[PDB]
């Protein structure tokens, strides 16, 4: 159906799926030099303590990485949230080169690739009627850039032989969603939506100011994934971000 | 606010040994994991250990000759030195970030863990 090629890309999503028009809509350009402080945020609370990842899987345009979401395992508070979302899956955006791939961008620089984090708050039930509700999602992104190897990320990278076309998925066990996350965690924050089908405007995004390293050579087995089911033509994931939207009226609060 | 307030530095002659404490305001010293890194003098900032509850993690220098635990139950963790090398004279400092993971734990980086402390003298004579 939708997808990132050119027939079916970003730009005729809003054909199908015309919230793509929305108000609130990610990814966007973070302009550094609008970005307004709020004595309101807290430092982000990343409580991963028992997280516990279950299943790498191709679903059709990147591939995730379940985790156990029976109870709150690994859950994100804190930061520019009220409340507290529980972990639920993590994916990539990766770009066609080196030079492009993230979603969303710091003063129009883009970075290799990008990790996003999704959790949704536990005052809905479940991930789905969740991501109904104008605050029922939290999304946490991480920059990926070129540089040097990244160990966590290989583990990963490292297996995605397992489900090279759609539908394919290995067990990905005992995985610290944490292996992954920047550093230092100061950040940028905002109200969006989801970067791919439905588009759902309730993803209050957090976004990671520091990026994690990823190497030249390793951002290339990415692109290795197939968009398509085993025995259909033959197609590469070569690329898989959406463009940076319109900010309309919203605004880009920060931790600093 | 988070209050990180360290104590029992001081001046200890080569193959002695102290203990540095650590003790939280606002702040529980389980949840999240927490660690000790050193300034010294000329050198940069260097990691010296970190704990999340039952997982420790030492620099690779005081590894075996250090060690570190909490005691949720009055909120501090403590950090005992032995068998101090001269070279150990420095400033440690206590850190307490908000991420609760083992392996971003293993980094040993208590020096990018938001919440710091003021550190406390601990110089070794021979």
């Known amino acids: 159906h939708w997808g990132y090629g050119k027939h079916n890309g970003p730009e005729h999503w809003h054909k199908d799926f015309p919230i793509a028009k929305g108000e609130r809509q990610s990814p966007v350009d973070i302009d550094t030099h609008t970005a307004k402080y709020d004595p309101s945020l807290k430092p982000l609370s990343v409580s991963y303590d028992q997280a516990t990842s279950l299943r790498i899987l191709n679903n059709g345009h990147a591939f995730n990485v379940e985790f156990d979401d029976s109870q709150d395992k690994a859950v994100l508070k804190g930061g520019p949230l009220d409340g507290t979302y529980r972990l639920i899956q993590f994916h990539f955006h990766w770009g066609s080169l080196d030079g492009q791939g993230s979603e969303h961008t710091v003063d129009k620089k883009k970075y290799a690739a990008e990790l996003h984090l999704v959790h949704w708050n536990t005052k809905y039930g479940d991930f789905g009627k969740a991501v109904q509700q104008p605050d029922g999602l939290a999304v946490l992104g991480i920059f990926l850039k070129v540089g040097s190897a990244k160990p966590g990320l290989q583990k990963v990278v490292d297996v995605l032989d397992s489900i090279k076309t759609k539908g394919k998925s290995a067990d990905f066990t005992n995985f610290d969603p944490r292996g992954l996350l920047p550093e230092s965690l100061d950040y940028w924050t905002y109200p969006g939506s989801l970067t791919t089908p439905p588009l759902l405007e309730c993803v209050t995004w957090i976004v990671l100011k520091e990026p994690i390293s990823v190497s030249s050579e390793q951002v290339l087995k990415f692109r290795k994934l197939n968009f398509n089911g085993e025995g259909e033509p033959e197609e590469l994931m070569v690329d898989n971000w959406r463009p940076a939207q319109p900010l309309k009226n919203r605004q880009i609060k920060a931790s600093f | 606010q988070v209050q990180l307030v360290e104590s029992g530095g001081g001046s200890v002659q080569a193959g002695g040994s102290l203990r540095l404490s650590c003790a939280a305001s606002?702040?529980?010293?389980?949840?999240?994991?927490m660690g000790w890194f050193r300034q010294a003098p000329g050198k940069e900032r260097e990691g010296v250990a970190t704990?999340?509850?039952?997982?420790?993690y030492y620099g690779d220098s005081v590894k075996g000759r250090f060690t570190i635990s909490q005691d949720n139950a009055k909120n501090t963790v403590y950090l005992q030195m032995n068998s101090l090398k001269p070279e150990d004279t420095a400033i440690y400092y206590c850190?307490?970030?908000?991420?609760?993971?083992?392996?971003?734990?293993?980094?040993?980086?208590?020096?990018?863990?938001?919440?710091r402390g003021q550190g406390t003298q601990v110089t070794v004579s021979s």
């Open positions: 850190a307490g970030s908000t991420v609760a993971s083992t392996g971003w734990c293993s980094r040993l980086r208590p020096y990018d863990y938001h919440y």
């Open positions: 704990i999340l509850g039952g997982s420790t």
């Open positions: 606002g702040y529980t010293v389980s949840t999240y994991c």
